[PDB]
C-alpha cells in the first residue's frame, strides 16, 4: 500500500551482514552463488562488489563508499553500519505521523554542529614527536601477527617518514621502495639510504669500493648497433666472413673507450652484453651490470640529476650522476651492491628479511598500509582517540545543544545521539561481554573534568587510556565518516515517491 514502509526495512539487511566484520574479530558469512566461487576473506567493501541487489536504495550507498576508500583506504564500513542504525530509531518517531522535512533537518543540524566539536577534541602533534609517531605505528602492525620483533619495525618506519619530510610538510609514498629478499630472520632487517641490487659484478677484476663514482645510464643495449633507417646485410664473397668479426673490434673499441674518457667509474645496462665487450671493460676496470628494470632506471636519474644517454658518442659530463659510496658485500644471504647516497637523500627504500617466501609477503603488506595511516597525520597534523572514544563524548554534548532548539522537534536531534552508541556496542559484543552494564563506566571518565582519552580495550577487556596502550586513528577518517553519514541518510529521508516508470535509457 504505502510501499515506503517496505523499503525502510530493506536497508536493515546489508548493514547487519557487514557489522561483525569490523575490527580485530569478525566471523565471515560467505554467500557463495551457484558457481561455487568461495572467497573467505574478512572484508566488508569486497562483499558489496559481488552480490545481487534487491532494491535500488541499496545501490546508492555503494557510491559514497568507493569515493571514500580511494581517498582514505579504511573506515568506509564504519559509516554504513551507523547509518542503518539511524533508520531503525527513526521508526519510533515515524509512527507519530511526523513530516520528513522536520526530521531530515534534525540530522543536518546535529551533523553541522559536530564539525566544530571534533576540532577542539583533536590534539595537535608535530613532525618530530617520537612518542606519538611510535604508538600509531605499533597499533596497526599488532593486528598482522608478528611477535618476532614488532618493536624494532615501529622504530625504523618512524625514522623513515620523519627523515623525508619535505619543506611543505607533505609525504610521497613513491619515495619509499620495498625489497622482498629472504634471509635468516627478521632480526636482520635494516633500512639503507639508497638502493640495492642483487646483480653482482660480472668480472672480479673490477673495483670493489669506489668513492664518488660518476653514474651513467644507457637506455640502449651494449651489443651490435643498427641504424634507425632500414638496412640489411648483404654477403656475396665468402672471404668477407672474417671482416664482420674484425669490424666489431673497432666499433666496440672507440665506443667503449669513450666511457673511460668521460670519467665514468660505474656503468649500468638493461639487456645483455656482447661477448667481446667483456674484454674492453677488463683492461679499463669499470663497474658494470645487466638486467635492470626500466622503472629503476628513472629513480636513479631523478634521485641524482643524471640523464639517460641513448648514444654513447653524444656523452657529456653534465649528464653523469654522482654516487655516494658503492660497494658489494653480504648481509646474511646473497651478496648485493649498496649504491648509497647520504649527501642528499631524495628517495629512500626498505629491505625486509624472513625465513621463507611465505613469511615476507605477509609483512610486505603491512609496510604499505602503515605508511597510509601515518602518511595522513604528517599532512594534517591532527589526531583523535581511537577505539570508538569519540562518539560517546559528543553524544553527551549534543543533548545540551538540543535544549536550545525549542518547539516539538528537539526529540529528533536527541534521537540521533542515542544511535551513536552502536560503535562501542559492536566491539563489546564481539569480545564476549555484556554491552548494557559496561556503558555506564565509560561515562564516568567523561562526566565533568574527566580525561578525554578513555576507551574500552578489546585485549585487556577494561576501560583504559588510548594514549597509553597506543590506540589512535587519523582525523580525516572521522570528518569524512560524519560528513558522509550525514549525507548518506538524506538519500532515504528525502525520497518519498516510488519510481515505477518504464523505459529509462
The residues that are catalytic are 43, 76-77, 369
Please answer whether residues 190 and 238 qualify as being in contact, where contact means their C-beta atoms are separated by less than 8 angstroms: no
Helix (H/G/I), strand (E/B), else coil: 500: coil
3-state secondary structure 402-457: HHHCCCCCHHHHHHHHHHHHHHHHHHHHHCCCCCCCCCCHHHHCCCCCCCCCEEEC
DSSP strand pairing (308-309 vs 209-213): unpaired
Q: Length of the chain, please?
A: 505
Query: Which three three-digit cell numbers place residue 319?
Result: 649528464
Containing 351, the helix (H) or strand (E) segment is strand 351-352
Distance, CA of 244 to CA of 266 (rounded, Å): 30
3-state secondary structure 278-333: HHHHHHHCCECCCCCCCCHHHHHHHHHCCCEECCHHHCCCCCCCCEEEEEEECCCC
* 317: CB partners within 8 A, 6+ apart: 262, 263
Beta bridge partners of 95: none
CB atoms within 10 A of CB 401: 18
Helix (H/G/I), strand (E/B), else coil: 370: helix
Please answer whether residues 367 and 350 qualify as being in contact, where contact means their C-beta atoms are separated by less than 8 angstroms: yes
The Cα angle at residue 69 between residues 486 and 72, in degrees rounded to 5: 85
Amino acid at each position: 500500500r504505502d510501499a515506503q514502509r517496505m523499503n525502510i526495512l530493506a536497508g536493515r539487511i546489508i548493514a547487519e551482514t557487514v557489522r561483525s566484520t569490523l575490527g580485530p574479530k569478525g566471523m565471515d558469512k560467505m554467500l557463495v552463488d551457484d558457481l561455487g566461487d568461495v572467497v573467505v576473506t574478512n572484508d566488508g567493501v569486497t562483499i558489496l562488489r559481488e552480490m545481487s541487489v534487491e532494491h535500488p536504495a541499496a545501490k546508492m550507498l555503494i557510491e559514497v563508499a568507493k569515493t571514500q576508500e580511494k581517498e582514505v583506504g579504511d573506515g568506509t564500513t564504519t559509516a554504513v553500519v551507523v547509518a542503518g542504525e539511524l533508520l531503525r530509531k527513526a521508526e519510533e518517531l515515524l509512527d507519530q505521523n511526523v513530516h520528513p522535512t522536520i526530521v531530515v533537518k534534525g540530522y543536518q543540524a546535529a551533523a553541522q554542529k559536530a564539525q566544530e566539536l571534533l576540532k577542539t577534541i583533536a590534539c595537535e602533534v608535530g613532525a618530530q614527536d617520537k612518542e606519538i609517531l611510535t604508538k600509531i605505528a605499533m597499533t596497526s602492525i599488532t593486528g598482522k601477527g608478528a611477535e618476532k620483533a614488532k618493536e624494532k619495525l615501529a622504530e625504523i618506519i618512524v625514522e623513515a617518514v620523519s627523515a623525508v619530510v619535505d619543506d611543505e610538510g607533505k609525504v610521497d609514498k613513491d619515495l619509499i621502495k620495498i625489497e622482498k629478499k629472504s634471509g635468516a630472520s627478521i632480526d636482520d632487517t635494516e633500512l639503507i639510504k639508497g638502493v640495492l641490487v642483487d646483480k653482482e659484478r660480472v668480472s672480479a677484476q673490477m673495483p670493489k669500493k669506489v668513492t664518488d663514482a660518476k653514474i651513467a645510464l644507457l637506455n640502449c643495449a651494449i651489443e651490435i648497433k643498427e641504424t634507425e633507417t632500414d638496412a640489411e646485410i648483404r654477403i656475396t664473397d665468402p672471404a668477407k666472413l672474417m671482416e664482420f668479426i674484425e669490424q666489431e673490434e673497432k666499433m666496440l673499441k672507440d665506443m667503449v673507450a669513450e666511457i673511460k674518457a668521460s670519467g665514468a667509474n660505474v656503468l649500468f645496462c638493461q639487456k645483455g652484453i656482447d661477448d667481446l665487450a667483456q674484454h674492453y671493460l677488463a683492461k679499463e676496470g669499470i663497474v658494470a651490470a645487466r638486467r635492470v628494470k626500466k622503472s629503476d632506471m628513472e629513480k636513479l636519474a631523478k634521485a641524482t640529476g643524471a640523464n639517460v644517454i641513448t648514444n654513447i658518442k653524444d656523452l657529456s659530463a653534465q649528464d653523469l650522476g654522482d654516487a655516494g659510496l658503492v660497494e658489494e658485500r653480504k648481509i646474511s644471504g646473497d651478496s648485493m651492491i649498496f649504491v648509497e647516497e647520504c649527501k642528499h637523500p631524495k628517495a629512500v627504500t626498505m629491505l625486509i628479511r624472513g625465513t621463507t617466501e611465505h613469511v615476507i609477503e605477509e609483512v610486505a603488506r603491512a609496510v604499505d598500509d602503515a605508511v597510509g595511516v601515518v602518511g595522513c597525520t604528517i599532512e594534517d597534523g591532527r589526531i583523535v582517540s581511537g577505539g570508538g572514544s569519540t562518539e560517546v563524548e559528543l553524544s553527551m554534548k549534543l543533548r545540551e545543544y538540543a535544549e536550545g532548539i525549542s518547539g516539538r522537534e528537539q526529540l529528533a536531534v536527541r534521537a540521533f545521539a542515542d544511535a551513536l552508541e552502536v560503535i562501542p556496542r559492536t566491539l563489546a559484543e564481539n569480545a564476549g561481554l555484556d554491552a548494557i552494564e559496561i556503558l555506564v563506566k565509560v561515562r564516568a571518565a567523561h562526566a565533568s573534568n574527566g580525561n578525554k582519552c578513555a576507551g574500552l580495550n578489546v585485549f585487556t577487556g577494561a576501560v583504559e587510556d588510548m594514549c597509553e596502550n597506543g590506540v589512535v586513528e587519523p582525523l580525516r577518517v572521522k570528518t569524512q565518516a560524519i560528513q558522509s553519514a550525514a549525507e548518506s541518510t538524506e538519500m532515504l529521508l528525502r525520497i518519498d515517491d516510488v519510481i515505477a516508470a518504464e523505459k529509462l535509457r
